[PDB]
Curated annotation (Swiss-Prot), chain B:
Name the record gives this protein: DNA replication complex GINS protein PSF1
Quaternary structure note: Component of the GINS complex which is a heterotetramer of GINS1, GINS2, GINS3 and GINS4. Forms a stable subcomplex with GINS4. GINS complex interacts with DNA primase in vitro. Component of the CMG helicase complex, a hexameric ring of related MCM2-7 subunits stabilized by CDC45 and the tetrameric GINS complex.
Subcellular location: Nucleus; Chromosome
Coiled coil region boundaries: none
Function, in words: Required for correct functioning of the GINS complex, a complex that plays an essential role in the initiation of DNA replication, and progression of DNA replication forks. GINS complex is a core component of CDC45-MCM-GINS (CMG) helicase, the molecular machine that unwinds template DNA during replication, and around which the replisome is built.
From Swiss-Prot, chain C:
Family assignment from sequence similarity: Belongs to the GINS4/SLD5 family.
Subunit structure: Component of the GINS complex which is a heterotetramer of GINS1, GINS2, GINS3 and GINS4. Forms a stable subcomplex with GINS1. GINS complex interacts with DNA primase in vitro. Component of the CMG helicase complex, a hexameric ring of related MCM2-7 subunits stabilized by CDC45 and the tetrameric GINS complex.
Functional note: Required for correct functioning of the GINS complex, a complex that plays an essential role in the initiation of DNA replication, and progression of DNA replication forks. GINS complex is a core component of CDC45-MCM-GINS (CMG) helicase, the molecular machine that unwinds template DNA during replication, and around which the replisome is built.
The protein's name: DNA replication complex GINS protein SLD5
Organism this protein belongs to: Homo sapiens (Human)
Curated annotation (Swiss-Prot), chain D:
UniProt record, GO biological process: cellular senescence; mitotic DNA replication initiation; multicellular organism growth
Gene3D superfamilies xref list: 1.20.58.2050
Family designation: Belongs to the GINS3/PSF3 family.
Superkingdom field: Eukaryota
Region (Not essential for folding and stability of GINS complex, but may regulate accessibility to the central complex pore): 1-13
Protein name, per record: DNA replication complex GINS protein PSF3
From Swiss-Prot, chain E:
Chief place of localization: nucleus
Keywords, ordered alphabetically: Acetylation, Chromosome, DNA replication, Isopeptide bond, Nucleus, Phosphoprotein, Ubl conjugation
Name the record gives this protein: DNA replication complex GINS protein PSF2
One biological process term in Gene Ontology: DNA replication
Gene3D superfamilies according to UniProt: 1.20.58.1020, 3.40.5.50
Cellular component, GO annotation: CMG complex; GINS complex; nucleoplasm; nucleus
Compartment(s) of residence: Nucleus; Chromosome
Organism in which the protein naturally occurs: Homo sapiens (Human)
Gene: GINS2
Modified residues (N-acetylmethionine): M1
Cross-link (Glycyl lysine isopeptide (Lys-Gly) (interchain with G-Cter in SUMO2)): K109
């Protein structure tokens, strides 16, 4: 069932008990966990926090803890599956679920006692009515069964994402009157994480930006003398109309332009004429080459006065109309200034680090620590890692596009990474592969001639384990400016594997990421083709 | 730890056991019941509760007589300080400040 | 009878005095017993209160502070006892009836056990295998005594007059000073130890 | 919670259980033998009267008596007028680490032999300490998170103890001001056992 | 004594807070803490004030002496004089650190206050250094240090006392 009053049905219920937190491995989940942790530590709530990265890890942890706890909170996991079947709990256990994944499983929606969903009812949710899915025989009973099959298939075809969990937690904090500035920053970072990964549409992002703008004004608006007397060490959050360039304040403008998928795709910098086009762009700006190649902080201040406006104008002349995005920045001290997307990229790079000296639960701990202002060194280290990852992404995209590795089957495009690829190791982890596939599709759509291939979704495969011969397979929908961001590849994959009898594993919390036995791969794909054409 | 026990001579182990017994007796004699265990409270207290991260697998750990919690690596717990001080001093838990 | 606040004040005073004195100071059984009893009563009273209260948490924090101070004080005394055990025991053995003791009965039992344990270990490990006339080690001479010529910082609680400062062995160099209430001095402990005993000065 | 027995070499007698004092008294000292010493010739068979030997300070202290029956003691060159004059010029430039690690402790124990130069040895040891105090205090209390190998190179054992105390005071305040003094941490011994 | 213990002592000083909760009078062993009423000021020990602030239950009020004009006068006076001048609090450094680290949002002009307190601390530390050098160089047996706070003494006390112990032993070598 859905929770109406977060204060009375969830927080007051849990305040007096011991609770177990299962936190998934994404930035939005980390920010939601941060907000909830602050709330719990304010009220002396005894909690245990367990990082989980997949279904097997969650099941193992629940088996380990089911005896010692009665209240569980799942952050960004558990909403799209029948939880009571996967976990097989006791009748007295209660599961609070704060998950962004959609659609919500019908069994979770219609449970009265054990499943409580911390999901806003104003979201995009069209749940089938209870009668049609739960309950002369040929005339009615068989007709009802066939109708249920049809409605359930239609309802569970596309996967998408709802409101950020960090924003839900911030709404809870505001209801309790315990909302601080750090909590608001965490909510902003969660929404920006949703945006950076194309999990939500542009309209939803702008709406939520306005919602957060109101809170920012309420928290940070003061008169002139109040600003004068306020210490520089107190955090300040500001709304900004800033540039799409990635990490440009912690890098050089040239490096940022070369390693941002937006500009890199539109300039075709993987080509030989793309560099000349970039030079023409910079000449149109009037920025000396030696200045744009210098680190942004060291660049002469006179060039920074109107940088955003001039970049917007030049980009408009060059066919880029979306150079400017509404976002937020945080300042503290004399030195420390960050845009939201910079924090998102740093956290992602800390979490998906290729340094295997440390495990993934170890990489999760680093990422969670970096979100606290006491661990600022971790945030700067993550910024450096993000720079390396962006360079690797652009190199891989260039290698894929120059060699014509993106081949169109009938209904979808297929690109496969090989072990001979230099940076393949950086993209073996599923999240990195998903982000790479999205960036690659954007570049390909910008740089292709065939009109049909521009309207196709993408399926991408990369090696996972050379011992078991397993390959990670990801599927993403077509890249369009007004895309609903809805994905049909999870059900398609499950239907292809069933029809062909391949050995597939669903461990990611997203159903569009799968593990496949390499030998079955070929076979699998044909079924998929026949299924989508 | 057995590693440390290895270096000691047998007579040194006997001395250590005798000293341990004497210290336990003295600590028991201070108060009405159970006395006061002055091996705890080694630093001035700041907060009633603290956040701890498990640095190694340790298994069941009793919070109250009724309830215990499983210590597994890289899990985090919000617990009273007086129940975690000893395991922190032994290198089993780490104190997280945020 | 002291008020509880005054009791905590004296606990802190003894804590700091023991922390900076070079020797074992006088035992304070009344302070320790009263503080332990106060903690027990407060624990009992909180047992009657509801768990969710802010008041319970505040009371627990205060009890934690008091417990820390008492534990640190007792640890300091135990360290001094272990460091100087033969001399502590010798002083206790020959104490006049009127003069106050530097050991509580429990500390005395602990010290006696410490001495016996260490002596038995030394005898059983090495000394019994040495030549017959080298088998006795006089622990009274082997263990160093407290150095009472240490320099300390003190704050004056009650005015004192005609304190004799002796810079060296020569008498002609010695002079006299006054200690005013609230003033702070740096001086050798031997000169002012009775004032620490009586409470006229506080070691900082 | 581990505190070794402290040195008592500056006092009238050294501490029986002090490792530093045992090492200090291991050091040699020239002597002249005032009586034939039978059955010990192998180690230096008799040792003839008037022979010149170098003995450990503990052995010289054991055999010495005020009337000079068994042996007479001569001061090491470091404590004689030639070096005392060098110390007076500028005590900050002399390397007391190479000229006996326990320079003060050894010189203090030399006063037991009742030399005619006792007042001069005593006065020299005091002035050397006074003349070196300011540099020791400044270097110890102001060298933060830096290499100190060049700052303690010329200090003797007693001075190196003071330097360590000064560094401890500086470090504690810096930790407190930076907010690191409130975290509960693994004990020092545990850190040196399980992570070293 | 270490710095954490001096801070523990400093935490017993009284400050004023405005709570956002209601509570009856608390009978602590240390002493009564008056009734708490939302919006009204009340005096509590610094440790409880910091704890309540960290739990979002109160707003702190700067002490009377934490004023820029007064602090500037005090710093100038400290720089003009030769000895230590009387300080507004016996734990001014610790109180400043705790209050400004945890409640800068409640204390206007916190940066100026921190800088002035730092100036005073530096001047007094230099005076203490001069005192120690004079003690050793002139071979004193006693000294007077009035208006010096516990944290200031503790910053270099152990070193100075150990040096003085060694120097005394060297001064009393010849006595049989």
């Amino acid at each position: 069932m859905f929770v109406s009053d977060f204060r009375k049905e969830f927080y007051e219920v849990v305040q007096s008990q011991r609770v177990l937190l299962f936190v998934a491995s994404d930035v939005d989940a980390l920010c939601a966990c941060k907000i909830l942790q602050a709330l719990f530590q304010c009220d002396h709530v005894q909690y245990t926090l367990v990082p989980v990265s997949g279904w097997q890890e969650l099941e193992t942890a629940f088996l380990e803890h089911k005896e010692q706890f009665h209240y569980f909170i799942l952050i960004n996991c558990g909403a799209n599956v029948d939880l009571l079947d996967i976990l097989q709990p006791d009748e007295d256990t209660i599961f609070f679920v704060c998950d962004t994944h959609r659609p919500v499983n019908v069994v979770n929606v219609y449970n009265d006692t054990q499943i409580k969903l911390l999901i806003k009812q104003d979201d995009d949710l069209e749940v089938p009515a209870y009668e049609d899915i739960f309950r002369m025989r040929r005339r009615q009973r068989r007709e009802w069964e066939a109708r249920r099959r049809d409605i359930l298939f239609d309802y569970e075809q596309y996967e998408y994402h709802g409101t950020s969990s960090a924003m839900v937690m911030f709404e809870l904090a505001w209801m309790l009157s315990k909302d601080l500035n750090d909590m608001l920053w965490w909510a902003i970072v969660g929404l920006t994480d949703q945006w950076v990964q194309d999990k939500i549409t542009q309209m939803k992002y702008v709406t939520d930006v306005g919602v957060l703008q109101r809170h920012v004004s309420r928290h940070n608006h003061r008169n002139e003398d109040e600003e004068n007397t306020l210490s520089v060490d107190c955090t300040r959050i500001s709304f900004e109309y800033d540039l799409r360039l990635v990490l440009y304040q912690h890098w050089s403008l040239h490096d940022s332009l070369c390693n941002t998928s937006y500009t890199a795709a539109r300039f075709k910098l993987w080509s030989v004429h793309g560099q000349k086009r970039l030079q023409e762009f910079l000449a149109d700006m009037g920025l000396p080459l030696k200045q744009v190649k210098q680190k942004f902080q060291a660049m002469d201040i006179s060039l920074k006065e109107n940088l955003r406006e001039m970049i917007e104008e030049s980009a408009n002349k060059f066919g880029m109309k979306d150079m400017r995005v509404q976002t937020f920045s945080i300042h503290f001290g004399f030195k420390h200034k960050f845009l939201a997307s910079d924090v998102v990229f740093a956290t992602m790079s800390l979490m998906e680090s290729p340094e295997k000296d440390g495990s993934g639960t170890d990489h999760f701990i680093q990422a969670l620590d970096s979100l606290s202002r006491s661990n600022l060194d971790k945030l700067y280290h993550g910024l450096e890692l993000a720079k390396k990852q962006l360079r690797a992404t652009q190199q891989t995209i260039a290698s894929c596009l120059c060699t014509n590795l993106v081949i169109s089957q009938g209904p979808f495009l297929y690109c496969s990474l090989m072990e001979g690829t230099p940076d393949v190791m950086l993209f073996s982890r599923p999240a990195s592969l998903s982000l790479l596939s999205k960036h690659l599709l954007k570049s390909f759509v910008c740089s292709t001639k065939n009109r049909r291939c521009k309207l196709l979704p993408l399926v991408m495969a990369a090696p996972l384990s050379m011992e078991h011969g397993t390959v990670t397979v990801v599927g993403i929908p077509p890249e369009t400016d007004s895309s609903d961001r809805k994905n049909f590849f999870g059900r398609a994959f499950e239907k292809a594997a069933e029809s062909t009898s391949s050995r597939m594993l669903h461990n990611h919390f997203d159903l569009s990421v799968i593990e496949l036995k390499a030998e079955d791969r070929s076979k699998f794909l044909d079924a998929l083709i026949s299924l989508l054409s | 730890p057995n590693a440390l026990r290895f270096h000691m001579a047998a007579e040194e182990m006997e001395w250590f056991n005798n000293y341990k017994r004497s210290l336990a007796t003295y600590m028991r004699s201070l108060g009405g019941d159970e006395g006061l265990d002055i091996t705890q409270d080694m630093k001035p207290p700041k907060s009633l509760y603290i956040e701890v991260r498990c640095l190694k697998d340790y298994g069941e750990f009793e919070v109250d007589d009724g309830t215990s919690v499983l210590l597994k690596k890289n899990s985090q717990h919000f617990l009273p300080r007086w129940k975690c001080e000893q395991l922190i001093r032994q290198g089993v838990l780490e104190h997280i400040l945020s | 009878v002291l008020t509880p606040a005054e009791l905590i004040e004296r606990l802190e005073q003894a804590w700091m005095n023991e922390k900076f004195a070079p020797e074992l100071l006088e035992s304070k059984p009344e302070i320790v017993e009263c503080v332990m009893e106060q903690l027990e009563h407060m624990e009992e009273n909180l047992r009657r209160a509801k768990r969710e209260d802010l008041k319970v948490s505040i009371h627990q924090m205060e009890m934690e502070r008091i417990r820390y101070v008492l534990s640190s004080y007792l640890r300091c005394r135990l360290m001094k006892i272990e460091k100087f055990f033969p001399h502590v025991l010798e002083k206790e053995k020959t104490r006049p009836e009127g003069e106050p003791s530097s050991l509580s009965p429990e500390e005395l039992a602990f010290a006696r056990e410490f001495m016996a344990n260490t002596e038995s270990y030394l005898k059983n490990v090495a000394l019994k295998h040495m030549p017959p006339n080298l088998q006795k080690v006089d622990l009274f001479r082997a263990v160093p005594k407290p150095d009472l010529d240490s320099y300390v910082f003190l704050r004056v609680r009650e005015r004192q007059e005609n304190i004799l400062v002796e810079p060296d062995t020569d008498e002609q160099r010695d002079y006299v000073i006054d200690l005013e209430k609230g003033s702070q001095h740096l001086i050798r402990y031997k000169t002012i130890a009775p004032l620490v005993a009586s409470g006229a000065v506080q070691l900082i | 919670a581990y505190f070794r027995v402290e040195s008592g070499a500056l006092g009238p007698e050294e501490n029986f259980l002090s490792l530093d004092d045992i090492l200090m008294s291991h050091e040699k000292l020239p002597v002249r033998t005032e009586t034939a010493m039978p059955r010990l010739g192998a180690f230096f068979n008799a040792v003839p009267q008037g022979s010149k030997l170098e003995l450990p300070l503990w052995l010289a202290k054991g055999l010495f008596d005020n009337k000079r029956r068994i042996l007479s003691v001569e001061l090491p060159k470091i404590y004689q007028e030639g070096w005392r004059t060098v110390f007076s010029a500028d005590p900050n430039v002399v390397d007391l680490h190479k000229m006996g690690p326990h320079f003060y402790g050894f010189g203090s124990q030399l006063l037991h032999f009742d030399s005619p130069e006792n007042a001069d040895i005593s006065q020299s040891l005091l002035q050397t300490f006074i003349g070196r105090f300011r540099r020791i205090m400044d270097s110890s209390q102001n060298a933060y998170n830096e290499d100190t190998s060049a700052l303690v190179a010329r200090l003797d054992e007693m001075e190196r103890g003071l330097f360590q105390t000064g560094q401890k005071g500086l470090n504690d305040f810096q930790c407190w001001e930076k907010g690191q003094a409130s975290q509960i941490t693994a004990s020092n011994l545990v850190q040196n056992y399980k992570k070293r | 004594m270490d710095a954490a213990e001096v801070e523990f002592l400093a935490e017993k000083e009284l400050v004023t807070i405005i709570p956002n909760f209601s509570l009856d009078k608390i009978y602590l062993i240390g002493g009564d803490l008056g009734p708490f009423n939302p919006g009204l000021p009340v005096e509590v020990p610094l440790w409880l004030a910091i704890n309540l602030k960290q739990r979002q239950k109160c707003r702190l009020l700067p002490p009377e002496w934490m004023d820029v004009e007064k602090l500037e006068k005090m710093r100038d006076h400290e720089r003009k004089e030769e000895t230590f001048t009387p300080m507004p609090s016996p734990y001014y450094m610790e109180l400043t650190k705790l209050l400004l680290n945890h409640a800068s949002d409640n204390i206007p002009k916190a940066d100026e206050i921190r800088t002035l307190v730092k100036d005073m601390w530096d001047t007094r530390i230099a005076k203490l250094r001069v005192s120690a050098d004079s003690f050793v160089r002139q071979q004193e047996a006693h000294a007077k240090l009035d208006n010096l706070t516990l944290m200031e003494i503790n910053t270099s006390g152990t070193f100075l006392t150990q040096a003085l112990n060694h120097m005394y032993k060297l001064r009393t070598n010849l006595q049989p």
